[PDB]
Symmetry: none
Subunit: 232 residues, 2 copies
């Protein structure tokens, strides 16, 4: 048991749910309760992809295993036709609720549709999307006294970076002096509540899951990438 | 002027020189004095590729510009023929001694022949070569108290990671308690000396070029990759 897999699942669940409610068809606006059950018939996975891309996709409405395997295949074929690299995931794995491969698939979707469009001044061309986001993060908190961004895990635990990023962007929203004397939990909660109320950024993370010696990397990157998106 | 470019040139020169002396024809066992002069005629570049690949390659012996440009074309064609992504390099650039494009070429060679070989359990497959090497480095230093590997620059500055990677494989060679007590210069000297004496790892880096606020990334990745090769 690694608690980061729990956090990751929660974060991806909130991410998927944020998208499904934006669907234009009212019957597609569903809510994931358990990420390892509610994608098994492929319907929410096809809906997710319709919202992220703006395309319509075909789907089967029958209820046998054959229909679920096919809905999943439609989704994975869609992704393949957009040159996403899906390796070692087959339709049965998703239809059957395999935890690790379901998490792998959603990460693949987040990476392809949200993270891999990032553009930062000072970009090398051999830089990875992750590297570009870390560079963006480092540039955003450059003026600020105690602060370093070394990674997407431990650097973020104390909530100061999240606050500093939002401050840089709109100094009105954040009292930095106060950040320097508040606890981790207070700083995290303050940054997440401001980002949601004032920037439109869905709360993907709970402070209790970030204030931990080894936070889940993909969850942090997903949230940080969602802040980047909220800044013109 | 960025001092890292000086370090990178020095690192790459030592890396090229370590290979040229392993050529099977004695006449090809040459020594690079200045990397921006001594590849211009193409002979050393063809020899390097011969030793890294095991293949014999054609070569021109004349001394006009025509011969130099052709020797260089033979090398770059060989590389294209092996599906190496060269972009923005011609003939002329290497024959004229272009510093940036000469460094870029050698980096492309190091990356294709030495670094892209890495394998460690629990890779993704969307994972880049550098990401695999970083994962390896993170794993190798997991048991060690206050050590973290976040990148291939500032994490390596103090010499502790080099000393830990070696201790993990040969615990008798280094005293980790002395490591936490020493200066960066001592730690780096000791790790590179031990690596060379007992593990056959050529010293590509001098301590004073690593113990700096911003170490050259490609130089460190080159050396770390050399450490990986000298393990089981």
């Amino acid at each position: 048991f690694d608690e980061r897999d729990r956090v990751q699942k929660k974060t991806f669940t909130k991410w998927v749910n944020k998208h499904l409610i934006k669907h234009w068809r009212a019957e597609a606006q569903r809510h994931i309760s358990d990420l390892y059950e509610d994608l098994r018939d492929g319907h929410n996975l096809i809906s997710l992809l319709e919202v992220l891309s703006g395309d319509s996709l075909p789907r089967e409405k029958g209820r046998m295993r054959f229909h679920k395997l096919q809905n999943v295949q439609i989704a994975l074929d869609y992704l393949r036709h957009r040159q996403v690299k899906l390796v070692n995931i087959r339709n049965d794995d998703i239809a059957d609720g395999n935890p690790k491969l379901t998490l792998g698939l959603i990460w693949t979707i987040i990476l392809h549709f949200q993270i891999s469009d990032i553009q930062v001044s000072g970009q090398s061309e051999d830089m990875t999307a992750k590297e570009k986001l870390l560079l963006w993060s480092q540039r955003m908190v450059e003026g600020y006294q105690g602060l370093r961004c070394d990674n997407f895990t431990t650097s973020w635990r104390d909530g100061r970076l999240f606050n500093a990023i939002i401050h840089r962007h709109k100094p009105m929203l954040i009292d930095m002096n106060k950040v320097y004397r508040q606890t981790n939990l207070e700083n995290l909660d303050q940054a997440f509540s401001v980002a949601e109320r004032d920037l439109g950024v869905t709360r993907l993370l709970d402070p209790e899951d970030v204030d931990v010696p080894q936070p889940d990397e993909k969850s942090i990157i997903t949230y940080v990438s969602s802040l980047y998106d909220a800044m013109p």
